[PDB]
Design a protein around this ligand. Structure first.
Ligand SMILES: [Mg+2]
Lengths: 666, 6
């Protein structure tokens, strides 16, 4: 282990990325990592198996503009998905030709299908090309992050929500410099409010949603585009339908001024409501809140219908309903997995979506609502080469947390294995921000299952949004600790039930999921054989200061206030490193072999989090003693600055895991 | 738009 300087007046200095001492600190930990990974002889064998299982063709869900359909395609191992078009159900843009692949993050086709606006990481910048001949327009727009490009129905330009060179809502006309873009909204009073936006399917209304923090609540402003004196060239006169942060609202459809909205107002599991803009105080349930299932999303389709995607004990259910009445017309349950990517719009009569699952790589279903609304027909099916899925099975069980609450978890494993404790086990989780963790497809997970005899578990802990807003709130702010408790209880069940045994269990997560993993190792290190935390939040007292971690106080709180500081100090990972051997009746326990993963250019979760936690752990556990009991290594894998890049990382983590758990190859 | 489900 290398030398790390503890500033007693300890690792505040790592918060500066560019000093020598930090950049040499990196190199030493890079240097140490590779030395460790060199000992994990199964890295290469995993790496090749991942590549062989990922090598299958994948189609994105298609969408229609005018007479044309568009979709992403990948032949198997291309760096980045390629965007294609066709005349019925051709390359349009191939990012593998730029830098040998960054992918497209923005992609947006005009209503007439003439123009394709898209965005690349120039090191997000939006460009536009003509679909007829693939020639570029000159228009270049910078300072975009996650805003889409929303085309007006005149095909003359589009809305987008850039930051300054204080988020703004702007309109760009085709064939102008970005400096001529109309400013539609900003708020210097509330620099932290951020924006999402949308245009109604009929083209009459531009909708602007304002949000405060990552909380699921938003304002709703409506600009009627048909009542502008000289269109958007004026400058705006928003109708402020909702001007507070009390509930969430998302527009699903409108008939003239009569709008249908999804909301969580007085409805933690969500519902569809109806309001007339011309009479704004009268809201009426259209599809009431289910007291059982989360209404996750809704989409108007085939002129007069609706498709509701419900989440019901962490499985999807799709309902077809009448738009005007709200009446149930059909209900299609979905096997364990996830459907999503429903991009069909109100004047589309064929609906497409994607189904993936732990043992199912990707199916694009097509429901023609005109002709055969009953059955899902397969449009595309991906097949994992050399893999027979009927030797495996996934099942769901519910497990009691500390406080009594049920925690649903999925368990993927080989069929008919004896529950004898002898199987290596990987547990994933996230638990935060109302994010739903679905059991989707991962090729590396298959390698683990087949070539390591592994058992995999996905834990739907609190903090997520799986049982609605109550599930969320029961795992945020003062209640964050429950999330960690849920996860620990999940491992305990895997042990007691006899899938695996303490120290034969690995855990992995990213971002908040990184927090999750860091928190749990401190509190219960005797449980785990291996921990892997991908760019987590590890400094809970200071996270808010950097880049855009300020929009997570909604879910975490903040040290600034005292009541909150006291939740935080209790689980903040760097401030909770302790020698588990220095505790009574706990002496053969050490920390699991740990791998902290992070980039150099992640300006979401800044890497200081990861670095400071590494510094601390190596100190308290290893180098702070002369003959530390901590034998298990504590390293970082740092990604200097794409399919193959992403495969390398995972191959490493899995090789490390296999070493850590003494899992042999099969 | 992930390139691969790794
Ligand atoms: Mg909503």
């Amino acid at each position: 282990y290398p030398p790390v300087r503890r500033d007693e007046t300890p690792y505040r200095w790592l918060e500066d990325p560019n000093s020598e001492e930090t950049k040499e600190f990196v190199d030493n930990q890079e240097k140490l990592a590779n030395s460790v990974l060199e000992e994990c002889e199964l890295i290469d064998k995993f790496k090749q198996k991942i590549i062989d299982f990922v090598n299958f063709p994948r189609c994105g869900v298609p969408f229609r503009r005018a007479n044309k359909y568009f979709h992403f395609y990948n032949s198997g191992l291309q760096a980045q998905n390629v965007f294609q078009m066709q005349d019925d159900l051709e390359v349009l843009y191939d990012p593998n030709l730029r830098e040998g692949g960054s992918g497209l993050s923005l992609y947006s086709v005009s209503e007439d299908a003439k123009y394709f606006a898209f965005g690349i990481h120039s090191g997000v910048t939006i460009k536009i090309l003509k679909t007829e001949d693939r020639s570029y327009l000159p228009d270049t727009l910078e300072w975009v992050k996650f805003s889409p490009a929303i085309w007006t129905h005149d095909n003359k330009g589009f809305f987008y929500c850039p930051y300054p060179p204080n988020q703004e809502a702007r309109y760009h006309f085709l064939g102008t410099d970005q400096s001529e873009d109309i400013l539609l909204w900003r708020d210097l009073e509330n620099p932290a409010h951020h924006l999402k936006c949308q245009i109604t399917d009929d083209g009459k209304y531009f909708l602007l949603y304002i949000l405060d923090g990552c909380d699921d609540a938003n304002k709703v402003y409506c600009l009627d585009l048909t009542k502008l004196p000289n269109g958007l060239e004026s400058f705006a006169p928003f109708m402020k339908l909702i001007d507070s942060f009390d509930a969430s609202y998302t527009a699903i459809a409108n008939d003239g001024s009569v709008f249908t909205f999804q909301t969580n107002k007085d409805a933690p599991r969500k519902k569809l409501v109806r309001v007339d803009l011309n009479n704004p105080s009268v809201w009426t349930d259209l599809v009431p809140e289910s007291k059982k299932d989360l209404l996750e999303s809704a989409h108007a389709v085939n002129e007069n219908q609706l498709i509701l995607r419900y989440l019901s004990d962490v499985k999807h259910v799709l309902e077809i309903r009448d738009l005007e009445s709200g009446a149930l017309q059909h209900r299609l349950p979905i096997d364990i997995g996830s459907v999503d990517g429903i991009t069909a719009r109100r004047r589309d009569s064929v609906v497409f979506f994607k189904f993936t699952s732990i043992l199912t790589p990707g199916i694009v279903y097509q429901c023609d609502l005109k002709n055969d609304p009953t059955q899902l027909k397969i449009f595309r099916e991906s097949v994992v080469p050399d893999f027979d899925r009927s030797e495996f099975e996934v099942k769901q069980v519910f497990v009691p947390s500390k406080d009594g609450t049920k925690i649903p978890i999925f368990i993927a494993a080989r069929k008919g294995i004896s529950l004898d404790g002898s199987h290596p086990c990987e547990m994933h989780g996230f638990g935060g921000f109302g994010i739903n963790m679905m059991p989707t497809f991962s090729a590396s997970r298959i390698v683990f299952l087949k070539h390591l005899g592994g058992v995999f578990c996905l834990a739907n802990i609190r903090g997520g949004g799986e049982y609605g807003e109550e599930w969320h709130k029961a795992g945020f702010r003062d209640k964050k600790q429950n999330v960690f408790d849920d996860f620990i209880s999940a491992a305990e069940y895997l042990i007691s039930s006899g899938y695996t045994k303490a120290r034969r269990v690995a855990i992995e997560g990213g971002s908040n999921g990184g927090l999750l993993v860091a928190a749990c190792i401190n509190q219960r290190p005797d449980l785990f054989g291996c921990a892997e935390a991908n760019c987590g939040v590890m400094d809970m007292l200071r996270f808010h200061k950097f880049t855009l971690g300020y929009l997570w106080t909604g879910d975490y709180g903040c040290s600034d206030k005292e009541e909150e500081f006291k939740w935080l100090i209790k689980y903040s990972p760097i401030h909770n490193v302790r020698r588990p051997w220095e505790q009574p009746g706990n002496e053969e326990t050490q920390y699991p072999a740990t791998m902290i993963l992070t980039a150099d250019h992640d300006d979401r979760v800044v890497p200081l989090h990861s670095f400071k936690l590494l510094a601390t752990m190596q100190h308290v556990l290893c180098t702070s003693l002369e003959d530390s009991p901590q034998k298990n290594p504590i390293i970082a894998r740092i990604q200097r600055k794409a399919t193959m890049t992403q495969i390398a990382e995972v191959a490493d983590r899995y090789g490390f895991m296999a070493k850590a758990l003494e899992a042999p190859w099969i | 738009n992930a390139s691969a489900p790794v």
